[PDB]
Amino acid sequence: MSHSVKIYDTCIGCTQCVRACPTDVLEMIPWGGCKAKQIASAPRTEDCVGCKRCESACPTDFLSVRVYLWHETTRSMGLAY
């Protein structure tokens, strides 16, 4: 929020797990101890659309994200044109 859909999990390891999703997710930001030690839920999200391709793969064990952002640009929906 402005893009706020929680995909977080607990491993945040990203090998044979999850990568897919247009730009949005430049992570691998190792928090001082979480197994394959790369963590959190996002980077700077003011860039791309609203997928849930976000999970589909690699756990969120709870919810998984979708549209919830409301405040919604245009570069945030393909169509500002």
Binding site: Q38, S41, A42, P43
Partner: protein, 138 residues
């Protein structure tokens, strides 16, 4: 254009990409390397070739110009590179910045992941009534 003709990524026609809203606002464009003359797939439906120059195709919107990867890395190459063009300059240096390949470590940048309290028992609904004096603007 022509009097300045600086091309690289061969095509011919198409009713696909770039139209009015890429001048009047933002621009978005991808660049790359390659070995020897090879025929590609394309966003916007079409299909052409390569060889070199800058290898610098311009693209409507940035979800469009990374898909050169979602197939254009099932066709060899470390190097592919898209930036952000305006109608005047910068701020938003798109694939520029620091390191590259979303899955390494130099810095941490943004992200966070938590809100106030974590995924735990938010059976707790919406709290205070939104009022200008208690840390809920994040």
């Amino acid at each position: 254009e022509l009097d300045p003709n600086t091309p690289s990524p061969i095509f011919a026609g198409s009713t696909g990409g770039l139209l009015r809203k890429a001048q009047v606002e933002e621009f978005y464009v991808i660049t790359w390397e390659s070995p020897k003359e090879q025929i590609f797939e394309m966003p916007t439906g079409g299909a052409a070739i390569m060889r070199e120059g800058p290898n610098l195709l311009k693209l409507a919107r940035k979800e469009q110009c990374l898909a050169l990867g979602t197939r254009l890395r099932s066709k060899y190459k470390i190097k592919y590179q898209f930036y952000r063009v305006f109608p005047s300059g910068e701020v938003q240096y798109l694939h520029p910045k620091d390191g590259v390949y979303p899955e390494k470590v130099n810095p941490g940048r943004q992200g966070v992941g938590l809100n106030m309290r974590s995924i735990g028992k938010n059976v707790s609904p919406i709290e205070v009534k939104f009022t200008g004096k208690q840390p809920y603007d994040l």
